[PDB]
DNA sequence: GGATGTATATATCTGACACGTGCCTGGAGACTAGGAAGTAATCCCCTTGGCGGTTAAAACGCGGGGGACAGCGCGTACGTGCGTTTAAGCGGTTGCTAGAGCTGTCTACGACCAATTGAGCGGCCTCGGCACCGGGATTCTCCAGGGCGGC
């Protein structure tokens, strides 16, 4: 299975982030301080089979 | 042997404590009215955490020259000191007037209260001016016919 999480603050974005950049798992990320070309290049990374 | 240095005692000066007195202003006691605390309702502004898109301001880098600063010379203007003058400072005259303080009288002026009403705040209707739409007058580009030339 694959994953999203929805969150309704960024900060805990960036704790949940933190999670798995210390717990060693490949995340990506979008919110409102990525701009749209690695907001398009994370979906398609995301999206990619 | 005479006079000088020094210690203890006595009279006088002076700031401070307590006593006395007035008086007037603060405190005690009582009453009352209203200022403010509390309550409920309504509505609008502010808070925190976000997103999206524009865009002009902020940031960064780099070249260069204008300006800040240091040094040096110089000459003038201010400091310093002394002798002389002069006017400030103090004490003094001599009267009159201004002003603080106190007491007294009175009167016009302002506080206070009730009734009234007319000037201030909000909305509604209308006009002055600006703007949207329809119709008439004026000017510009174009398509076709007539005449001339060539094989």
Do not use: W
């Amino acid at each position: 299975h694959r994953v999203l999480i929805f969150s309704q603050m960024v900060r805990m974005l960036d704790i949940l982030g933190d999670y798995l950049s210390i717990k060693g798992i490949n995340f990506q990320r979008l919110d409102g301080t990525v701009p749209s070309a690695q907001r398009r290049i994370s979906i398609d990374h995301f999206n990619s089979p």
